[model samples]
Target chain A: ELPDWAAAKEFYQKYDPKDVIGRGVSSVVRRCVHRATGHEFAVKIMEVTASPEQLEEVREATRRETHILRQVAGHPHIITLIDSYESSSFMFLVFDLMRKGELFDYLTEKVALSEKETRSIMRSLLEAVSFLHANNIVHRDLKPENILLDDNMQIRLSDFGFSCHLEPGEKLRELCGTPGYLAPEILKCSMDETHPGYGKEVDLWACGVILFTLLAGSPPFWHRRQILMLRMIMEGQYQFSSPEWDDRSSTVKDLISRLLQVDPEARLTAEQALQHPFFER
Target chain B: ELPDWAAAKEFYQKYDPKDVIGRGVSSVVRRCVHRATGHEFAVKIMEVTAERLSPEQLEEVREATRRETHILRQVAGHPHIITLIDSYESSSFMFLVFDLMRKGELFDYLTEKVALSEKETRSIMRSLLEAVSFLHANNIVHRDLKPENILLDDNMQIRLSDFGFSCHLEPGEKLRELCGTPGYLAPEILKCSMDETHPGYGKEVDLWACGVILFTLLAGSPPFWHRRQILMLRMIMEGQYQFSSPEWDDRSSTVKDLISRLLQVDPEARLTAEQALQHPFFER
Candidate 1:
């Protein structure tokens, strides 16, 4: 469904800005309420701030994100796009606001979640991501910050900024997404050579990282040096060290291992991951 | 060693330019002989047509010519590298003289032979790898490593020529520019455009080119050659290639394994010029 379009200034009159929820390089998310119905939403505003070349580049990115968001709308686990507005200087996207904020903050305050809780979050994430994969979409960027929680603490996968649709047998060539969660095949493309671009398996790789983080309170690949960090990612270097993972279930560990394989062909898909014994348990 | 400096008029008086040997976009190579000694040499004359170049662009062209002469001088005595005999410069042109390799470029040789025998391939690769290994040890990367740039002496010894795209990098330094022929370019060089995290390519790119050269020498065609340049680049990036039937059916797995190591997508994983020399394929 097409989102209702309004003039950029009309958005301000129709929705009352309560407070800023998030901020980015050129974009900001604010808590806004529909004046008549008293419905709260997140108004993501992106402002122009560069040369004509950069302007068009950012415009295309904005347009692509909006188109993809609209394409993937209506899923329970995915955030809803309510309205959009644009002016010569700015663009505003209206989305369903999750009062609880990012899962990143939730994990930061609580450290690691229990196995049962981790499984529940993983299930919701897999369901949401599986739905995306079914639609031939790959959420190139999946991180704690991008995963939001509603007032009820249910998962609502946000940040469609890096998501992309892959045509049948077509792989994406763009080097995108977060560094720590990057798949080996994605890193493989960084070489001074040609590559068969990455596909949906990359999302599953991010899922593995998220699952590991949910249990360990840290990413599998991390170092003070960015080069070392990327090298670790390309090499699939990580371990469930004792005390942290000593008590974790074998099935969950197995699931993570399967997802973290360097070879994409060997890695489990979203559907295959959901079918694992750990989820059943 | 620096060649004796002479005016452009003096070069014409000292040596007589003979048959044209090769030509380039802005330069020409001709066989020149010392008038008194009749000693044969290849004179590479570069003209500053300038055409549409600004002052800075003209300066850049002169600098490139000077850089190539300087690098050639640095690696002069290497058995597998061509020898720089003399150099002359004028405001509008630069002339580089080198010992003539009578057999000409390796490209023509390969064209005639189609594919070299295993023993012949081993000998040529050893000579080429030795030259590349020496260059890398001295911190020089010959970004363009294709048959067109490789020469053959009367004895069929590899005389690595054309230092136009060669660069000297410090041990930890890297290059950002995309250089080299498409079929010979390394994936890391290709990735620099699209990959933000890439730190840029280094000496390893030369080794990737060597891999392509070796593949072509044995297979009669470049491993990644395609009608479309984009598809060819994709094949190089993915390191997607195979030894086809008839040509490779009788070839040893040891040689194939060596090629695989050299053409590795991961630059770090590719065999160094030194390591490649020690492979089982070389021992055979």
Candidate 2:
């Protein structure tokens, strides 16, 4: 249910929004809770004075996000889109609160997961994406800021500001999403009007990036900014260094190769990806 | 543009369709190239019939797969989505013409990556998912697949496919226990959502499977899957395990925590694909 501005403000005050949890280009996340229910949540508030483009983007993003939520509404894996509304000067989206903070914080602790633990996490991630794919929804921005964890350690996919809807015969021309996760096709802006470029296959490419990070504690395409990463990806220059290799099995490398394939058609489909022997281990 | 069935068949026959480049549930990928252009490509062919639910599922998978190709059509670091050409189906294969990769499967050289001096691990995976997340935007599932299905050439960029088990969202239901590998299966199915009354499964299951593969690459085995198959399934549903002594001490607790959360028995308990993407573990 949507909350009105007054109720939203009351909810914010009741929980006493404090200590910024995160800050994005247009908004900030604050830790808050329901005074009566003791239910914690993250309140993403955007300043009303944002530029016309910023406001438009925010509105589009929120609208797309809400649409995505409505499609996969009740799955336990996704973050609950509890409430959203705007005030004269602010726009707020309240989500189920998570305590573990950003994945960056967790990674800093330097605790690596065993093979078993890593597998478990990967399985959940695949399931969530599988569901999204099934529903014809694409999450364009899939960086670390979009994921949230609860006290119980459950992960919730959030923030669909850059997401979009895909129809059967349509090809999108928008070059949107975080640079680190952008696919080669998006960066190249190919002129093949017939194909009009790539599709959701870009997501699988990003999944490859995520998988590599989880295992090796670093990204394969290391760069200081999106521009460099984009250049490397477009050139198909990414490779595994000696330290990331393991002599015992080439499965991970194989999976990464397919996921990161510069040619989209040659890329591994999600269904086909599930059959890889690396996963058999 | 989408090529017709004849052009697709001609495309497949034109290229050598050489080597068992990659294999997945319903299809096999072979490295090929256009005879005239000499441009390399990978062809994914799936067998389908208007016959059974499984076959229908296969068709649906093909339909959904188009969405993935559509999303990839825009990005740069990734291979081009090229064209989705159809061809005459033999009882054995269905044809999909795509960009050709020459280096071969990354599985063939995983040792190199593990031993490499540079920390390309995070960069590679982030780049890969950047593409996958794009496909996810269109609500498509690339089911019944794994690393063996992925292909790579000298450049090391990825090309993903294999849609045998892929399907579009069905109304009033979100879970399925019949698809995917045992080790990669999420806990929700282990809990058995087939009962109809059960909470059922969704896209997060795919991410959980990915976690298993990611962990195996890092540590060299399917974590829980290494145990008795049935027991592992049971354990997944139970969703409890402590990092054993030696392993726990060597790794980061946060990493361990992320793993546990992904493996949650309940789909609802697991992390969403988008959420998992945001985990701090992904930061540079």
Candidate 3:
């Protein structure tokens, strides 16, 4: 395949790229304003420089992302996929322009948001997650950095590059996703060759990490590097900090404890978690 | 018809009455050991008086009581209806000794019970209401009044009792007796009969009484008064209450609002037990 960098530059020149909004490991996101209509869009340009197997992986990732986004288009809290097109050497994904930037940076700078604000964010997140789970789509990577916020501070769950659509009663064997938020079963699947496959509940474990991060202003397990944090996650030693707890209601703690269970079967289902008394209040 | 008082005494004597565990309108509840194997039971003695009643009404009431108890048995939370052990006619009246209760008046002690210390009581009350609401299945009433009708044990468990005045409707017209304690009676029961054929008193009356009980425990007083029942009921119908005093401390406005809806004088406006249980007061 032709090098994607030249091809992306040509597409950007044709679209008249306004500014670079974000950059990731494999792609760069640019805010593109149409010259005629002045309507804004986020164009994600994926660089296509890899061996045949790696190219296939990127194509599969892009295709899966497009498919998942289409399935969840009507959901209010998920990033809307507008269009997907590709040049001879690069794939371009266009999404709705989110102006509020990354939730990870917001949490890092603000440290802690009020419960009402956090709840608003959580309500949207849970709504999107519930919709995804209902459709049997598991978001394999769910970190604050992957979550985007819009102008009104509404959360949009982005980054479906690693997500997968699961079939009814099917189990997944893929050992993918960032280590820190990976479920214990995923780690076991990665380390042990003979382990049985896990299902979408592994994503729920990552969601628990994301929830703890949102509520406590940081993830329950934090380390200097991803490897050590992954070890701690697999060990399931994370719990709420004392200052972050409200002892009058054990439902919140109980929910986190249940969601972060080492055994996938013991983990709380999304519907069951919605019924929890923590949400009841 | 024979009186129930004689049959109740005979049952008490036969079963070896242990102690006077509780008392209510038209009944004496006692803790007793079964004559055969020493199993503990609460013996409820309903004293039936020979008030000029036709054989049809007697059969209907007894059958209605049995049907209601059967419905209550299928539910959870309220005390289980063990058995209708002995029913006999003596001295021109019928007497029935139900399963004795090993409890006290739930309203007397548990209303002011400390928070968290009596979570079990709250659970039990919730269960009791659940059972009572299930009785709508059979269209039966648990009429009569006051804290005396509510029993509690060492564990603060509650059992609703005194079903003598309880009645079943035939779907159209309302049954009237001017029954139920004055402070707890619904406004419709006290109103002059606009149509003698349809008195308009039914299951909603029981709901009104429940509201009074809830308000009495939570607010420490009945919503209305003993004087001018109609006018006071009119005030209740209008949803009048004082909420600015020290009495309103710790209790949420939603709780009071739910209680008001339950105690509404208009039967159509009153909150059913099922609906009241869903109020935010009992949300968690």
Candidate 4:
């Protein structure tokens, strides 16, 4: 995915690196303008040479995600990846400029989301997940931060940096994701070699955590310490905190309970989530 | 560079493309807004489809834009010119975004029978010269330099634009591209040089265009007419146009002298924008 060093540098310089639109610890996304044509794109410049194996991890990530994105390129709920390039130490992904910004920022506002907004967001997210799962791809890093809104307030699922494609019988045994959004099975069994498992169901579990945040305005299970947060995540216990759920319907809680199942086998699949009673209402 | 069709359709819908601003035979430029941020841009939507252009003409336009972008990338941005904000590549058409021009083209005023004093005209001319001079100093030529391409800001300040016939060249490099409007073309281009070494014109073509602009400011019509290219070419080649009418009675001698120098039949003797700014026309 990282084009050779020279080509990558030339591509990177085309965009304004100083105007960073989003940033992570090891990577930064900047709003870039094509030097020749002046078309705008968001370039995710991930520093892959940060540590051992990181370079290979990113190489594979970009390839896998590029393949997956092209596979689901036209899905209504998905953020489109326009192109990608790489250098020795960095991988750059070019995407549309989501002018309204990330869905995570939108959700952080003090305003309460109407049932219509919540359902609209949920249906779109589920459809995107369904598309990914149907294509045998797992969005291993689905989260609010990875969600974006178009200028029309349309939901666009993004950031497949950790996503992967699987054969029919294959499972993703790797334990990798944003900790706060990681599923119970992924947290309990996959982090170490102690238990050898995880699958596409993990994405559905993350969706439940996202739903919880959507209604409650904060993550259901979170701790400052990484290890403590991992432990709480494994226990799979998040209460319907305060007035946040007081006004929400029962169908919303019922849907979350199924998706938040501790055992991967019992969790709601993307199809089940789409067909949840809340949507019918 | 077209993106996925469905995805592009969704993408274009979000821009809120609105009222048409400028129209050409094959395309229209419209004002568009990003629905979420309310940020504005002028989108020149060029549909590369059937009927917009004959197959041959379409290919030429594509080639012309290819050259325009090549030169733009080489020149990048100039202070006195319209800044190219961005271009959006989609399946059906191209969207060229420019910073909002709330006002209109300079001709929007001149054609409306508006009149300005000598001082105001000089200031506008100075800005136009600044833009053209910058282009020339960079070894680029703007063959079509006229009122239509000269956009105006809300303040009536000039934003020199439209590089459809502009290109890069080394100093003293010769060109044979006969691609500008008839009225604005320099005599060297009009001479249509065919000898390999003397194919056509050079940077002086731009200065000649500037002279026509200045001529029209006083003449109340184009110095050379687009419809009368055949009749005017020899007159232009002989430097036959001069101030001899009632419009000439009140004009200062310096104004006429400045334009006369710019219209030098020999490209080598023509006044560059740099030299034009130093004329007595701006001294007052």
> What digit string (tens of lDDT, one per residue) describes model 3 on residues B42-104?
655443321324778656655655654454344323353234555544432333445555555
Place model 4 in a CAPRI quality band.
Answer: incorrect
Which runs in model 2 stand beyond 4 Å of their true positions?
A1-10, A13-19, A50-57, A111-113, A190-195, A224-228, B1-284
In candidate 1, residue B276 scores what lDDT?
Answer: 96
Q: What is the C-alpha lDDT of each candidate?
A: 0.84, 0.60, 0.67, 0.76
Report the C-alpha displacement of residue B110, candidate 2, in angstroms.
61
Candidate 3, A23-73: lDDT as tens digits? 676666877665557778888877554166877877776777888889888
* C-alpha root-mean-square deviation, candidate 1: 23.5
**Candidate 4 local lDDT, B121-154, one digit each (tens):** 7887888888888888888899899888888777
Q: Which window of ten consecutive residues has the lowest lDDT sum in model 2 chain B?
A: B115-124
True contacts kept of each: 0.00, 0.00, 0.00, 0.00
State the lDDT of candidate 1 residue by residue for A12-115, as single tens digits: 55666545678787776878778889988888878653177877777888888888889878999898889987654568789999988999999999999999
> Model 3: runs farther than 4 Å from truth?
A1-14, A50-53, A225-228, A243-249, B1-284
Superposed on the true interface residues, model 3 gives a C-alpha RMSD in angstroms of: 45.8
The digit string of per-residue lDDT tens for model 2 on A112-231 reads 434555555555556677677777777777655666677776677777776777775556667887676777887776545554765777777877777766666777677777667767
- Per-model TM-score on C-alpha atoms: 0.49, 0.46, 0.46, 0.48
